[PDB]
Write an enzyme that holds these catalytic residues in place. Structure first.
Site, PDB file in Angstrom:
ATOM      1  N   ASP A   1      36.509  19.144  99.441  1.00 28.95           N
ATOM      2  CA  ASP A   1      35.276  18.155  97.684  1.00 28.95           C
ATOM      3  C   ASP A   1      34.393  17.386  98.352  1.00 28.95           C
ATOM      4  O   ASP A   1      34.324  16.107  99.064  1.00 28.95           O
ATOM      5  CB  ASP A   1      36.364  17.294  96.383  1.00 28.95           C
ATOM      6  CG  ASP A   1      35.539  16.558  95.648  1.00 28.95           C
ATOM      7  OD1 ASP A   1      35.078  16.516  95.347  1.00 28.95           O
ATOM      8  OD2 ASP A   1      36.546  17.280  94.697  1.00 28.95           O
TER       9      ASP A   1
ATOM     10  N   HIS B   1      33.361  17.689  92.900  1.00 27.98           N
ATOM     11  CA  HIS B   1      33.995  18.021  91.242  1.00 27.98           C
ATOM     12  C   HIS B   1      32.781  16.585  90.010  1.00 27.98           C
ATOM     13  O   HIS B   1      33.344  17.390  89.120  1.00 27.98           O
ATOM     14  CB  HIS B   1      35.370  17.313  90.733  1.00 27.98           C
ATOM     15  CG  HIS B   1      35.699  16.493  91.420  1.00 27.98           C
ATOM     16  ND1 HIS B   1      35.845  15.499  91.990  1.00 27.98           N
ATOM     17  CD2 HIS B   1      35.854  15.126  89.975  1.00 27.98           C
ATOM     18  CE1 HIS B   1      36.491  13.954  92.184  1.00 27.98           C
ATOM     19  NE2 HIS B   1      36.280  14.362  90.790  1.00 27.98           N
TER      20      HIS B   1
HETATM   21  C1  LIG Z   1      36.232  12.621  89.559  1.00 25.09           C
HETATM   22  C2  LIG Z   1      36.955  11.446  90.328  1.00 25.09           C
HETATM   23  O1  LIG Z   1      36.205  10.608  89.246  1.00 25.09           O
HETATM   24  C3  LIG Z   1      38.719  11.383  90.154  1.00 25.09           C
HETATM   25  C4  LIG Z   1      39.025  10.031  90.614  1.00 25.09           C
HETATM   26  C5  LIG Z   1      40.121  10.313  91.104  1.00 25.09           C
HETATM   27  C6  LIG Z   1      40.617   8.801  92.561  1.00 25.09           C
HETATM   28  N1  LIG Z   1      42.138   8.841  92.540  1.00 25.09           N
HETATM   29  C7  LIG Z   1      42.065   7.323  93.493  1.00 25.09           C
HETATM   30  N2  LIG Z   1      44.119   8.431  93.800  1.00 25.09           N
HETATM   31  N3  LIG Z   1      41.210   7.254  94.435  1.00 25.09           N
HETATM   32  N4  LIG Z   1      38.393  12.489  90.616  1.00 25.09           N
HETATM   33  C8  LIG Z   1      39.759  12.941  89.933  1.00 25.09           C
HETATM   34  O2  LIG Z   1      39.008  12.657  88.213  1.00 25.09           O
HETATM   35  C9  LIG Z   1      40.625  13.815  89.644  1.00 25.09           C
HETATM   36  N5  LIG Z   1      41.140  14.858  89.589  1.00 25.09           N
HETATM   37  C10 LIG Z   1      42.785  13.687  89.419  1.00 25.09           C
HETATM   38  O3  LIG Z   1      43.133  12.543  90.449  1.00 25.09           O
HETATM   39  C11 LIG Z   1      44.024  14.139  88.837  1.00 25.09           C
HETATM   40  N6  LIG Z   1      44.739  14.989  89.070  1.00 25.09           N
HETATM   41  C12 LIG Z   1      44.716  13.202  87.640  1.00 25.09           C
HETATM   42  C13 LIG Z   1      43.261  12.259  87.360  1.00 25.09           C
HETATM   43  C14 LIG Z   1      43.800  11.343  86.265  1.00 25.09           C
HETATM   44  O4  LIG Z   1      44.940  11.073  86.207  1.00 25.09           O
HETATM   45  O5  LIG Z   1      43.157  10.465  85.043  1.00 25.09           O
END
Ligand SMILES: *C[C@@](*)(O)[C@H](CCCNC(N)=[NH2+])NC(=O)CNC(=O)[C@@H](N)CCC(=O)O
Ligand SMILES: *[C@@H]1O[C@H](CO)[C@@H](O[C@@H]2O[C@H](CO)[C@@H](O[C@@H]3O[C@H](CO[C@H]4O[C@H](CO[C@H]5O[C@H](CO)[C@@H](O)[C@H](O)[C@@H]5O)[C@@H](O)[C@H](O)[C@@H]4O)[C@@H](O)[C@H](O[C@H]4O[C@H](CO[C@H]5O[C@H](CO)[C@@H](O)[C@H](O)[C@@H]5O)[C@@H](O)[C@H](O)[C@@H]4O)[C@@H]3O)[C@H](O)[C@H]2NC(C)=O)[C@H](O)[C@H]1NC(C)=O
Ligand SMILES: *[C@@H]1O[C@H](CO[C@@H]2O[C@@H](C)[C@@H](O)[C@@H](O)[C@@H]2O)[C@@H](O[C@@H]2O[C@H](CO)[C@@H](O[C@@H]3O[C@H](CO[C@H]4O[C@H](CO)[C@@H](O)[C@H](O)[C@@H]4O)[C@@H](O)[C@H](O[C@H]4O[C@H](CO)[C@@H](O)[C@H](O)[C@@H]4O)[C@@H]3O)[C@H](O)[C@H]2NC(C)=O)[C@H](O)[C@H]1NC(C)=O
Ligand SMILES: *[C@@H]1O[C@H](CO)[C@@H](O[C@@H]2O[C@H](CO)[C@@H](O[C@@H]3O[C@H](CO[C@H]4O[C@H](CO)[C@@H](O)[C@H](O)[C@@H]4O)[C@@H](O)[C@H](O[C@H]4O[C@H](CO)[C@@H](O)[C@H](O)[C@@H]4O)[C@@H]3O)[C@H](O)[C@H]2NC(C)=O)[C@H](O)[C@H]1NC(C)=O
Ligand SMILES: *[C@@H]1O[C@H](CO[C@@H]2O[C@@H](C)[C@@H](O)[C@@H](O)[C@@H]2O)[C@@H](O)[C@H](O)[C@H]1NC(C)=O
Ligand SMILES: [Ca+2]
Ligand SMILES: [Ca+2]
Ligand SMILES: [Cu+2]
Ligand code: NA
Lengths: 651, 137, 234, 670
Positions: free
Chosen positions: C88, C42
């Site tokens: 992913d 993504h």
């Molecule tokens: C794409 C990548 O930069 C992010 C980072 C997620 C890391 N998560 C954890 N738990 N370490 N992935 C997100 O952008 C993917 N989408 C989401 O997490 C959304 N469901 C929520 C986004 C948010 O709450 O800011």
């Protein structure tokens, strides 16, 4: 999850003859002969621990294992540990080892079934007779205890060639998988709580491999009693009594209530006078734990009151059948000296294998003084197979929860047994040597760095025996032994009421009268403290006559089981009572003389033989009262009394 | 014996232990080496069990004060070393450094790209500088 | 990265930083070889055009360690969708070879069986990147690290309100303020073994950032090792 | 330190087990026995406190608190020596009331036995340890009995409940401040042959009343009761107490069938449903023909203190109206469509072979078949139609979810579908239907062959699995026309009452990789409605059959797992590092407890890892297994009986092969 220990074990299915009721008839002193089977000795096979990989020098069962009975040796490993258990089939039958919950590859399962496996590691599935193998077991997180819950968990390993008949043949054992940091580096024994592996199981002999079904062609009509005769509803394979179940008062006991019983071995584990706490995330309070077949539940009960209570399933049939072993709850302060330091045990009750010169066994008095004050041997029999021993006779089945040890010197040479070990017996013929939790066959107790300094070693679990033999193994230029064994009575309710530790308040003690010192001090009743030290620390009376008494109010009706008296020392004389009798009342006015059960004349107790000699006396019947007066009858040159009551309250 | 000036003369093996019941102190001064005297002291009290070599698999038998011990090679362990070993890479990773692949029950230490199996068959060695999975130093 | 510690000098050489047209770090990466970088799927949509920087311990400064590398070929899984964040995975073959040096080292790819049976049963992994220090925060220019404990599959499927697919594993705390945040996606989830670090997961997503009751979510690398090795033949 | 004084006098009575006082001024035969029962008297033994119409042989219920000390007054009015001995009290030697080799003096032997007329007031100090914990219900339920002759004495009836309570939950009226009702049921086993009368009879009774003739109990709708149940027997026994149309809470586990054993007792918080009258029973099949079936009346008391809790809009989205369409078809079910040749030949010729007089394997049965629409014209194609066997369609639901189970009856006899997690209201459907008074009251309207009904259940907040339960709880559903005759026909399933947000949009669980049902339906076709239909249609010569033959009657107990004999079921396969959810629930005529063993694997049972999972009849337990060790392993019942040992299930912990994601990637330059 890799920096652990490779737990090394060597389990051999050896052949022994097991008689379940071998500890019922050792206490046969009753006119009853209708609650026991006949010819209860059987031939079986049992897992037995071996110290060496060659299976020559066996590992004897000490006292922590005394309650195991027919079970195999305890196998223990913390989480993420690797267990190597080597099987040595010493029977005339192919056995194996199974496991529950542990992480094991198909080279250590031990159970043979249609799993379609290549045979290069099937040599675990059914180990053939006379052979050997090695089962590798890993204790992952899916086998440890809860978080947070109890400190350990219970699993049951057994031979898995045909378990439904291989467990009736005696092949079964405890497998405990604890939390990290609980078991020992070498001993592989837990350190925090007291664990009682109990196997509430029915040993139906009509299914074992060694069932001697001889020809029954000539036999009378069935009496419907022999069919149930071969079934033994027993705890750890011992009916009607099981030794070793000895726990302190108000102490937490981690009960591993194992059960590999059949489809009808419903057992409601019940402790008489106790309540069971199912530890875990949700702690539940129970009186009885309804145990189920195949369960291994790790409860934690809190001891209530000392005495001979009754562990038993509450199923009615399994009560008179035999699954009711009197477990022994002991007093919280079962540290009571057994009389060597006081004088309860006289010199005529002490023997020895040998002695040097005037160091007779009569010198086993703890903290004894003079030129000769200990039991010493010139040369320790290390070269011989029988090291010198000293023996003491308790004249009755008692409990010894510990020991003290000292030494002495010839005015320049500090001589002391830097090591020793203890052997106990009841009939002075069948001897057993204390092992405790030591790695070796026997717990060679740590001795004293110096002769005078004490080294208290606690006999855990406590020793229930009348005769005690102490055989030193090491020395410092000479063995030199002083000891005071410590423990309480087998019958509970013998804890000191508090005349010495101050639990009984000073104002609770009231005197008929008392005297005055040469400067002004008084022998007030509140100064009747046991073993009290000082110029004036004894209770007296102003007038030397029968009309004296020492009234002490218990503030609660207590059940007194015994009494211990003492005497005092004057400036130039010894002061003590020579005879007396006790009086008591439920309200403090209606004093009764203490008579015998068949006598109408007051039992004139034998008073203090001398000053310090604890003249212990018992109460049959006891004293169920809140008030008590000890009325003296005879005293030597004056009257003095620093007594102590050994009883428990009413709940 | 036990003359007034026996301790002044230099020590001799025959004088102290062979002609008399020597103790630990008297034997050490003759040899001056703790490791040498310990070997002689172990056999003195309980004989030499290692003379017949009770253990198997060319065990490096060691004589002590009432006990014997042989440190054996891979595939045979224990006091006697008479039994082989289940390789079982589940425990301590089969003494490897990287992945195990279970052929018939011999532990097979493996190494991926940029890595080479060692001579002993247990360790892995990188082929070139800065291999996979390592901090720069 | 909520909490955790900053990557020391040479402490995280496997970390490759993606920079958009503005040379601003938006996703992390992992070095697989001299030509390949491991990232998340993504992350490709966030810029639609990007460059790969390696050896950077700080995005906002130049210290002689930064190395912006052009990307030759971008390959990603087709089944990957943003609805579920499943599959992913994405690997970037660079136009120029990666010059391994101080703070620039690749990462291993353990065998499929040994990784599942040993690595997926270890205690703690390692995650790093240039994400936010807290939820709805600012992506720190410095490179941080975080020790994310593994969580059993059954245990971590309960907390997440969205399904955790078989290609995903969770690591973090059901209570604590420790999790990688926005800006860490495409960062490594490596596993230590005898001082040898192996790639285990790629930072896929996460509900919030280090919320009490939550763990971070990662995509299991071992599910695509054949896919990765085939893609590494590009 | 409050002190109390109860009054119990062991006055044995001329007792008929059917209600003697509840008679219409007629003799009603005698059929009586000389029991020995505890009774409650006015203080200082001046007169008696009249007992309830239901307490029967139960003594005066005791109630203490932490710190508060009881003093029970006792003086035997029978001819035997008797004492009083309660479970779960840290009593002393002077009031223990137990006679064994305690080495105690005759003064302390007074409690051991009380001579007829002799008096002794037992004091029971109640410290903090004996009292309930922070996680326990308010009033812990114990049981007291005489400990003179533990077998013969109890079978006379000297039994009564003890209720140690929490510090501050008791009035002086014998009830609790926090509870609007309180009941003490008794499920005890009385053996007259062992009783002091020594008359040849065995009596399974409810509150000392036999064959479900005990008077009903009156409560209020939505009443916060605190029930107390007693189990007691001298022979080993398995009580499974169930309150039909109701859901309990046994120590914060939302159990429906609460199970006990001999000499055991339990406490359960319990909020009633609407006005109605169900038939309580103890589901264990031994107790089912024995008639331990009590009753209950729910009166509509005008109390409106609380009838709703918090219902919000945000949860209305989650209230998905699931529409299951279950039927009941009478067809032939085979526990062995295919049999391996390696299996035991001797057993095949008795319970499996179609003998000239023994049917063996193929039997006529009725089963729960799922559908997708109201027309019932297409069976729902689940992947495991052969794997899960005859088990009913999993009815997955969440809290507040308004289910619509459209049950259908294509069978040849009336049946029902009674859940185990819905306090379903019987006053929801009748509007203008005429009811006849007193003629075969089936709990649900008799669905005649070919009739259909639309059940509309509801997972109220009282059926939410608490914080200590699995996300989805297995609670069997069965046709409640006769629990014996019906589950034997296979009308058994599992109702996965999941928590909130525990199901996806489709209706599948969101925390289990694979959902696996494992139900040990120990059938008995001779206890099925088709026992005559099973024999006649398959037997070549039906003129020589005898139901009394163990070679025929015991040749019909077909112990199975999920509907197939384990020697005739497929080996399972679950991929490595998954989380298979196991749905365990015992049914059928299994009078014993079936403990199963997971070879090489363990599961999670209540924040705790266990390897052997005990099972009571018609009680469901759900555990989830993480496939974590490569090999081919087994699931077996450790019970020694040949019927209970042939239950051996084989499963492989394989390594998941591709996963063919290798041949699907796209290449694009930036
Ligand atoms: C794409 C990548 O930069 C992010 C980072 C997620 C890391 N998560 C954890 N738990 N370490 N992935 C997100 O952008 C993917 N989408 C989401 O997490 C959304 N469901 C929520 C986004 C948010 O709450 O800011
Ligand atoms: C309520 O109204 C209902 C009807 O509506 C009535 O229901 C009846 O309940 C009775 C109990 O009150 C059941 O009694 C049956 O009696 C027999 C036992 O007595 C026989 O054996 C005695 C010796 O046995 C010893 O153990 C038994 C164990 O139960 C004790 O009961 C007994 O006291 C002894 O200690 C002899 O002295 C006596 O003369 C009798 O011969 C049994 O038939 C039965 O239990 C056994 O049988 C059944 C079925 O047997 C088959 O299966 C077993 C499998 O184990 C197999 O071994 C056999 O060979 C057979 O194939 C098993 O299920 C049991 O486990 C036992 O083996 C009962 O105990 C009546 O059955 C019951 N009637 C019906 C129709 O169900 C009731 O009277 C009313 N009141 C109540 C309940 O209070
Ligand atoms: C005995 O069991 C109780 C649960 O089981 C009961 O019986 C079973 C068979 C089911 O029918 C079940 O539904 C029954 O309740 C057990 O807990 C009880 O749980 C209910 C439901 O959650 C509680 O009702 C509501 O609780 C809170 C108040 O509770 C506070 O304390 C509890 C500690 O127990 C905490 O968990 C809570 O978070 C709360 O802090 C209130 O929200 C509410 O009252 C009103 O609140 C506001 C207005 O003030 C509005 O939303 C509504 O008007 C609400 O009505 C409810 O009362 C119930 O309180 C709780 N019982 C008790 C005694 O608190 C119970 O604890 C068990 N007993 C013991 C000793 O453990
Ligand atoms: C065979 O059995 C004998 C007794 O017959 C054991 O004797 C033990 O002797 C060792 C020392 O050699 C003692 O070990 C240490 O004792 C202390 C106990 O403190 C714990 O308990 C108190 C009381 O509540 C707590 O307040 C306290 O926090 C401790 O928990 C401590 O110094 C040590 O405790 C260590 O371990 C515990 C458990 O993890 C930790 O909580 C502590 O932080 C600390 O790390 C330690 O235990 C021991 O007490 C003696 N036993 C008894 C029963 O008194 C032999 O060890 C045993 N030999 C074997 C098995 O080989
Ligand atoms: C195993 O052994 C049986 C007799 O035991 C023999 O003596 C003991 C002391 C051991 O040393 C044992 O190994 C010896 O064999 C034999 O009768 C039996 O046949 C042997 N079993 C097999 C399967 O070979
Ligand atoms: Ca930079
Ligand atoms: Ca007694
Ligand atoms: Cu009991
Ligand atoms: Na969290």
């Amino acid at each position: 999850s890799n920096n652990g220990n490779r737990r090394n074990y060597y389990i051999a299915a050896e052949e022994i003859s097991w008689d379940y009721s071998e500890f019922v008839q050792r206490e046969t002193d009753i006119e009853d002969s209708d609650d026991i089977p006949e010819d209860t000795t059987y031939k079986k096979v049992v897992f037995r621990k071996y110290l060496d990989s060659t299976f020559t020098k066996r590992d004897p069962r000490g006292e922590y294992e005394e309650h195991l009975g027919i079970l195999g040796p305890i196998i223990r490993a913390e989480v993420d540990d690797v267990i190597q258990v080597r099987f040595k089939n010493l029977a005339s039958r192919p056995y194996s080892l199974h496991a529950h919950g542990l992480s094991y590859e198909k080279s250590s399962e031990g159970k043979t079934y249609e799993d379609d496996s290549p045979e290069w590691f099937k040599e675990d599935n059914a180990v053939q007779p006379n052979s050997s193998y090695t089962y590798v077991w890993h204790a992952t997180e899916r086998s440890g205890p809860e978080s947070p819950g109890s400190a350990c968990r219970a699993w049951a390993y057994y031979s898995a060639v045909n378990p439904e008949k291989d467990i009736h043949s005696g092949l079964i054992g405890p497998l405990l998988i604890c939390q990290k940091g609980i078991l020992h580096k070498d001993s592989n024994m837990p350190m925090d709580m007291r664990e009682f592996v109990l196997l509430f199981m029915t040993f139906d002999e009509k299914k074992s491999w060694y069932y001697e079904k001889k020809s029954r062609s000539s036999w009378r009509l069935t009496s419907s009693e022999m069919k149930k005769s071969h079934e033994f509803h027993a705890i750890n394979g011992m009916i009607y009594s099981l030794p070793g179940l000895k726990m302190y008062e108000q102490e937490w006991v981690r009960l591993h209530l194992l059960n590999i019983g059949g489809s009808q071995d419903i057992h409601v584990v019940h402790f008489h006078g106790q309540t069971l706490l199912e530890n875990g995330n949700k702690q539940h309070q129970l009186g009885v734990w309804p145990l189920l077949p195949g369960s291994f539940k790790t409860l934690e009960m809190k001891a209530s009151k000392p005495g001979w209570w009754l562990l038993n399933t509450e199923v009615g049939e399994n009560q008179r059948a035999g699954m009711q072993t009197p477990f022994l709850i002991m007093d919280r302060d079962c540290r009571m000296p057994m009389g060597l330091s006081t004088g309860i045990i006289s010199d005529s009750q002490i023997k020895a294998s040998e002695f040097l010169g005037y160091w007779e066994p009569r010198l086993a008095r703890l903290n004894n003084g003079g030129s000769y004050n200990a039991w010493s041997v010139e040369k320790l029999a290390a070269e011989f197979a029988s090291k010198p021993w000293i023996q003491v006779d308790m004249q009755k089945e008692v409990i010894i929860t510990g020991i003290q040890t000292q030494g002495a010197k010839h005015y320049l040479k500090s001589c002391y047994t830097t090591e020793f070990y203890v052997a106990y017996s009841s009939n002075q013929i069948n001897w057993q040597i204390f092992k405790g939790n030591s790695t070796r066959n026997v717990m060679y107790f740590n001795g004293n760095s110096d002769a005078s300094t004490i080294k208290e070693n606690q006999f855990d679990p406590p020793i229930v025996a009348r005769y005690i033999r102490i055989s030193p193994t090491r020395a410092y230029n000479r063995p030199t032994l002083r000891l005071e064994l410590q423990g309480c009575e087998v019958n509970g309710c013998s804890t000191p009421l508090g005349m010495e530790n101050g639990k009984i308040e000073n104002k609770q003690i009231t005197a008929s009268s008392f005297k005055k010192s040469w400067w002004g001090d008084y022998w007030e009743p509140f100064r009747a403290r046991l073993n009290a030290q000082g110029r004036v620390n004894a209770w007296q009376a102003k007038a030397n006559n029968n009309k004296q008494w020492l009234e002490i109010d218990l503030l609660k009706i207590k059940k007194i089981t015994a009494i211990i008296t003492q005497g005092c020392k004057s400036l130039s004389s010894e002061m003590y009572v020579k005879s007396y009798t006790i009086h008591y009342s439920e309200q403090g006015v209606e004093w009764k003389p203490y008579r015998l059960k068949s006598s109408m004349v007051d039992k004139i107790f034998e008073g203090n033989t001398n000053t310090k000699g604890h003249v212990k006396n018992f109460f049959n019947p006891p004293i169920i009262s809140r008030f008590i007066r000890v009325i003296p009858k005879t005293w030597n040159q004056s009257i003095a009394l620093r007594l102590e009551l050994f009883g428990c309250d009413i709940y | 014996a036990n003359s007034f000036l026996e301790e002044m003369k230099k020590g001799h093996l025959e004088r102290e232990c062979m002609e008399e019941t020597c103790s630990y102190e008297e034997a050490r001064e003759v040899f001056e080496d703790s490791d040498k005297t310990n070997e002689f002291w172990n056999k003195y009290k309980d004989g030499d069990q290692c003379e017949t070599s009770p253990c198997q698999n060319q065990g490096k038998c060691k004589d002590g004060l009432g006990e014997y011990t042989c440190t054996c090679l891979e595939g045979f362990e224990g006091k006697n070393c008479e039994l082989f070993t289940r390789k079982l890479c589940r425990a301590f990773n089969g003494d490897c450094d990287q992945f195990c692949k279970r052929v018939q029950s011999s532990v097979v230490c493996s190494c991926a790209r940029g890595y080479t199996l060692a001579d002993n068959g247990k360790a892995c060695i990188p082929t070139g500088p800065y291999p996979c999975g390592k901090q720069t130093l | 990265i909520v909490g955790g510690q900053e990557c020391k000098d040479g402490e995280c050489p496997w970390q490759a930083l993606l920079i958009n047209e503005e040379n601003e770090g938006f996703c992390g990466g992992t070095i697989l070889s001299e030509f390949y970088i491991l990232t998340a799927a993504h992350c490709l949509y966030q810029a639609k055009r990007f460059k790969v920087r390696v050896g950077d311990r700080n995005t906002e400064q130049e210290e002689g360690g930064e190395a912006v590398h052009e990307v030759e070929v971008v390959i990603k899984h087709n089944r990957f969708t943003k609805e579920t964040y499943d599959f992913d995975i994405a690997v970037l073959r660079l136009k120029t070879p990666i010059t391994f040096r101080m703070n620039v080292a690749p990462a291993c790819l353990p065998e499929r069986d040994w990784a599942n049976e040993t690595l997926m049963k270890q205690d703690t992994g390692i995650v790093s990147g240039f994400g936010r220090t807290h939820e709805k925060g600012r992506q720190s220019t410095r490179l941080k690290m975080l020790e994310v404990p593994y969580v059993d599959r059954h245990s971590c499927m309960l907390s997440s309100d969205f399904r955790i697919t078989q290609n995903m594993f969770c690591a973090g705390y059901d209570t604590k303020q420790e999790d990688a945040c926005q800006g860490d996606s495409g960062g490594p989830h490596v596993t230590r073994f005898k001082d040898t670090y192996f790639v285990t997961g790629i930072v896929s997503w996460g509900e919030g950032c280090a919320r009490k009751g939550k763990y971070g979510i990662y995509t299991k690398v071992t599910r695509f090792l054949k896919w990765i090795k085939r893609s590494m033949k590009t | 330190a409050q002190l109390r004084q109860f009054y119990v006098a062991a006055q044995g009575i001329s007792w008929s087990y059917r209600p003697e006082p509840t008679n219409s001024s007629l003799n009603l035969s005698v059929t009586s026995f000389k029991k020995i029962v505890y009774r409650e008297y006015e203080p200082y033994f001046k007169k008696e406190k009249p007992q309830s119409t239901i307490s029967g042989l139960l003594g005066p219920t005791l109630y203490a608190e932490v710190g508060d000390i009881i003093k029970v007054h006792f003086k035997n009015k029978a001819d035997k020596p008797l004492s009083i001995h309660p479970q779960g009290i840290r009593y002393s030697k002077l009031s223990e009331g137990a006679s064994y080799l305690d080495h105690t003096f005759p003064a302390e032997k007074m409690d051991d036995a009380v001579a007829p007329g002799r008096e002794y007031t037992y004091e029971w100090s109640i410290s903090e340890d004996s009292g309930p914990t922070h996680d326990d219900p308010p009033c812990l339920t114990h049981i007291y009995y005489s400990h003179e002759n533990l077998i013969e004495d109890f079978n006379s009836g000297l039994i009564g409940p003890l209720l140690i309570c929490k510090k501050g939950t008791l009035t002086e009226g014998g009830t609790q401040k926090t509870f609007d009702k309180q009941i003490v049921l008794l499920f005890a086993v009385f053996d007259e042959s062992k009783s002091w009368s020594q008359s040849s009879s065995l009596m399974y009774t409810v509150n000392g009343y036999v064959n479900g003739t005990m008077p009903d109990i009156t409560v209020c709708a939505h009443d916060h009761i605190s029930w107390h149940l007693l189990g007691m027997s001298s022979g080993p026994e398995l009580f499974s107490i169930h309150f039909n149309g109701q859901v309990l809470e046994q120590n914060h586990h939302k159990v429906s069938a609460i199970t006990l054993v001999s000499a055991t007792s339990t406490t359960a918080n319990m909020t009633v449903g609407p006005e109605g009258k169900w038939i309580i029973s103890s589901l264990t099949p031994k107790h089912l023909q024995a008639g331990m079936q009590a009753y209950i009346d729910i009166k509509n008391c005008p109390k409106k203190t609380r009838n709703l809790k918090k219902i919000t809009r945000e949860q209305r989205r989650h209230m998905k109206r699931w529409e299951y369409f279950i039927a009941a078809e009478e067809v032939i079910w085979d526990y062995a469509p295919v049999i391996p040749a390696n299996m035991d030949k001797k057993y095949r010729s008795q319970h499996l072979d179609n003998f000239s007089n023994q049917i063996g394997k193929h039997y006529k049965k009725v089963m729960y078949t799922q559908y997708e629409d109201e027309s019932f014209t297409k069976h729902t194609v689940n992947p495991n139609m052969k794997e899960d066997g005859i088990l009913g369609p999993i009815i997955r639901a969440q809290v507040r979810d308004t289910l619509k189970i459209v049950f259908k009856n294509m069978a040849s006899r009336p049946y029902s579908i009674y859940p185990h997690g819905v306090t379903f209201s019987p006053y929801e459907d009748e509007v203008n239907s005429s009811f006849t008074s007193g003629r075969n009251n089936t709990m649900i309207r008799a669905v005649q062959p070919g009739e259909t009904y639309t059940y509309k259940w509801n997972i109220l907040e009282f059926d939410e699995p608490t914080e200590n339960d699995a996300q989805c709880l297995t609670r069997p559903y069965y046709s409640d026309v006769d629990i014996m005759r019906d589950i034997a026909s296979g009308l058994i399933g599992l109702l996965l009452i999941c928590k909130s947000r525990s199901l996806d949009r489709r209706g599948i669980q969101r925390a289990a990789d694979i959902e696996q049902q494992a139900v040990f339906a120990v059938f008995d076709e001779n206890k099925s409605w088709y026992l005559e239909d099973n024999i006649n249609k398959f037997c070549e010569n039906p003129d020589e059959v005898k139901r009394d033959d163990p070679k025929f009657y015991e040749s019909n107990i077909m112990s199975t797992i999920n509907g197939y004999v384990p020697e005739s079921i497929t080996t399972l396969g679950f991929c490595f590092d998954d989380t298979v959810q196991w749905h365990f629930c015992s049914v059928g005529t299994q009078n014993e407890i079936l403990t199963i063993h997971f070879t090489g694997h363990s599961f999670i049972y209540g924040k705790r890892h266990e390897d052997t999972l005990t099972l009571f009849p018609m009680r469901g337990e759900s555990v989830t297994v993480t496939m974590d060790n490569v090999g081919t392993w087994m699931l077996t019942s450790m019970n020694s009986s040949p019927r209970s040992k042939k239950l051996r299930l084989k499963f492989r912990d394989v390594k998941c092969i591709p996963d063919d994601d290798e041949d699907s990637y796209e290449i694009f330059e930036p």
